[PDB]
């Protein structure tokens, strides 16, 4: 509900913004205009701490002493089945850290959220997306009112920037995993009070490689060559974990290509490679062909002949996914199966290989069974099982799971009884902009621009998505006047 | 150096909607554009917007019963509704007027098109500038940054479609 995006275009005498944003927000988070544009990705900025309290004598232990809770008696109303409401009491207990919650297992936890004193989130975004210059953009960003997100920026003057943005507490010790778990709630040692300014955070501007990127990876290869390393920052800002195969593809697609056109940029975004197959099939196939089971041999020959792309017509891709579920977990992020582990020294070519081929063939054996049960056969076309269905529009799917290496993402659901599955998460608003004069931009919204019952604008873009047939985005008045189908005059009197 | 194309200067307030239901909102000043934007959003996503604003008031349990209760406890315990009132008062006067206009656009869409608002979210109306601030606050700080799941020791993401 909360995550649904909406596309819009605003024009006044003093500003212009085009793009997508979460419904209910009065500013456009994914915005561009004739001068500039930004986008966002989740960085998981650790902006809160959960403290384990030690309860003692009706208070909590803190620096050797029992300390009483701040307590207030509040209440809220709860609607009953018969349409009335009843008054329910609610105690709000609080420690120095913040408000206290009790987990089902009895753990008393106090949550401390940073940046509760930052009222200007909406205005900061607003000033960012209507900035007259990069310096103005940066001064807005530097206010620290937007508590999270990677944020990427480009403009018609030629500047690009990546910022690992958010409001991060200053701490004197502890790495990210420590501050992500339950931190001890019995000592002022772990009670932070200040937060980092913008120039303490990983950022990159106009780097020698001529691009920036982020695909939810930790911020240590935002560009290539890199301009910093993890030791340049406090160890609690971001993980030092293996980069996903999608994120590896992100770096490669940008770094290895040059003399880019908007057209080629768009084509690169559609990348749907089974990178994990590149890392595993060289060891897996010969090991599997040794197996006496003729079904495993046949499975191995089907995988070997596959071009390793998640296309609609792929007969091997479903089977490969089912193998990967076992070899790398249900999220495809597990590392224990590989022979050569991930390394930041080879960040787009590790991990690699199959550590234990014999065990992996056993995983293939099980995956064959799983595949036939889910989909009816080991060689069902990928796009016959994977469909994009909104109202009465039913179109073939392509691309897939990010952790298998697909850049363009469709997190396919578990299949229904007929083996049909649809995206639960993935491509929504997709736009590509060139900051020429005038700007040129194309985009699509997977699930349309409206969700009101009976609208003709819920399912009217998904067929175009199935063919990567992008809409030209219309910012110039004359383009808008040529395309208009409805005019709503309004007037606002405060 | 080459300047950008001449900016368009709106002379009247209007939404030009294209064939995919994208609103092109022209305002003679900022508050007008924000009003148009709220009207549009109400038209395209009104019901779920009203539900979300209702929740961010801490009134989910009151409006819609037990399925909304744990979110209500999370938000009231974290003081979200009152903090939003403070952030709203703490806005710069000019941006506050933009937020007020946005909310007024929602209210106006609903008032002019009451058939399009689902019965059980009607009780949310009217919405205010502070509701707009509150929803943003709950989204950023109390879904993205601090989720109920990570504090309460639960797990799987939201589940209401």
């Amino acid at each position: 509900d909360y995550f649904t995006l909406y596309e819009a275009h605003l024009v006044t005498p003093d500003f212009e913004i085009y793009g997508a944003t979460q419904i209910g927000l009065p500013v456009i988070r994914f915005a561009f205009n004739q001068r500039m544009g930004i986008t966002n990705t989740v960085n998981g900025m650790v902006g809160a701490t959960n403290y384990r309290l030690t309860l003692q004598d009706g208070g909590y232990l803190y620096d050797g002493q029992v300390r009483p809770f701040e307590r207030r008696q509040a209440s809220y109303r709860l609607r009953q089945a018969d349409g009335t409401t009843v008054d329910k009491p609610l105690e709000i207990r609080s420690s120095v850290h913040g408000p206290v919650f009790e987990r089902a297992d009895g753990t008393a936890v106090a949550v401390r959220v940073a940046g509760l004193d930052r009222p200007g989130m909406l205005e900061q975004y607003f000033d960012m997306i209507t900035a007259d210059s990069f310096d103005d953009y940066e001064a807005a960003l530097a206010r620290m009112q937007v508590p999270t997100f990677n944020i990427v920026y480009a403009d018609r003057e030629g500047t690009i920037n990546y910022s690992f943005n958010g409001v991060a507490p200053k701490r004197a010790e502890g790495d990210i995993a420590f501050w992500q778990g339950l931190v001890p709630g019995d000592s002022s040692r772990y009670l932070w009070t200040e937060t980092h300014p913008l120039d303490d955070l990983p950022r990159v501007t106009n780097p020698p490689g001529g691009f920036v990127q982020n695909s939810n990876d930790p911020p240590w290869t935002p560009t290539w060559p890199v301009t910093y390393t993890p030791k340049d920052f406090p160890s609690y800002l971001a993980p030092q974990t293996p980069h996903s195969l999608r994120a590896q593809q992100s770096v490669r697609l940008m770094s290895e290509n040059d003399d880019l056109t908007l057209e080629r940029f768009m084509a690169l975004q559609l990348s749907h490679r089974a990178v994990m197959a590149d890392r595993t099939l060289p060891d897996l196939i010969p090991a599997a062909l040794i197996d006496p089971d003729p079904e495993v041999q046949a499975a191995a020959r089907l995988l070997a002949a596959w071009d390793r792309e998640f296309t609609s017509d792929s007969r091997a891709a479903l089977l490969f996914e089912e193998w990967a579920r076992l070899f790398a977990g249900q999220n495809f992020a597990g590392q224990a199966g590989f022979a050569t582990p991930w390394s930041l020294d080879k960040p787009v070519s590790t991990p690699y290989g199959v550590r234990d081929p014999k065990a992996a063939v056993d995983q293939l054996r099980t995956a064959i069974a799983n595949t036939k049960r889910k989909y009816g056969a080991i060689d069902r076309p990928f796009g016959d099982a994977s469909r994009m269905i909104l109202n009465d529009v039913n179109v073939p799917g392509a691309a897939g799971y990010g952790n298998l290496g697909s850049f363009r993402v469709f997190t396919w659901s578990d299949p229904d009884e007929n083996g049909v599955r649809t995206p639960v998460h993935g491509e929504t608003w997709v736009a590509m902009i060139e900051f020429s004069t005038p700007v040129r931009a194309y985009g699509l919204m997977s699930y349309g621009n409206s969700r009101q019952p009976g609208t003709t604008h819920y399912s009217d873009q998904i067929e175009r998505v199935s063919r990567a047939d992008f809409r030209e985005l219309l910012l110039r008045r004359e383009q808008v006047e040529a395309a208009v189908q409805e005019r709503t005059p309004f007037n606002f009197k405060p | 150096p080459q300047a950008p194309i001449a900016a368009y200067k709106p002379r009247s307030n209007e939404i030009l909607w294209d064939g995919y239901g994208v609103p092109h909102i022209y305002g003679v000043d900022a508050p007008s554009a924000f009003y148009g934007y709220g009207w549009a959003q109400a038209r395209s996503h009104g019901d779920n917007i009203l539900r979300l604003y209702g929740e961010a008031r801490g009134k989910g349990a009151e409006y819609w019963g037990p399925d909304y209760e744990q979110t209500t406890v999370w938000l009231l315990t974290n003081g979200v509704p009152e903090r939003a009132q403070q952030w709203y008062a703490q806005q710069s006067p000019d941006f506050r007027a933009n937020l007020d206009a946005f909310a007024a656009g929602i209210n106006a869409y609903a008032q002019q098109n009451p058939d399009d608002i689902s019965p059980d979210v009607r009780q949310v109306l009217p919405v205010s500038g502070a509701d707009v601030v509150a929803h943003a606050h709950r989204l950023m700080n109390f879904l993205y940054v601090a989720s109920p799941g990570r504090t309460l020791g639960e797990g799987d993401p939201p589940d209401l479609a």
């Binding site: 995550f3 649904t4 995006l5 997508a20 994914f30 561009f32 544009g37 930004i38 986008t39 966002n40 990705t41 989740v42 990677n150 990427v152 480009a154 403009d155 018609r156 030629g158 500047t159 690009i160 920037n161 990546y162 001529g210 691009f211 920036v212 990127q213 982020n214 695909s215 939810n216 999608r246 940008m254 040059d258 003399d259 880019l260 056109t261 908007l262 940029f265 975004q269 269905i389 909104l390 990010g402 850049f407 993402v409 649809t422 995206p423 639960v424 998460h425 993935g426 491509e427 929504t428 608003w429 736009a431 590509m432 902009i433 060139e434 900051f435 985009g443 997977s446 699930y447 | 479609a161």
Partner: peptide, 28 residues
């Protein structure tokens, strides 16, 4: 989600490029 920005020197026409590409729930 994915995000790309490309500097002028890496393009043919000499203008920066931007990809907006948030991955979010469809909630069908």
């Amino acid at each position: 989600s994915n995000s790309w920005a490309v500097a002028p020197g890496k393009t043919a026409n000499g203008n920066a490029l931007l990809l907006q590409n948030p991955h979010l729930s469809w909630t069908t």
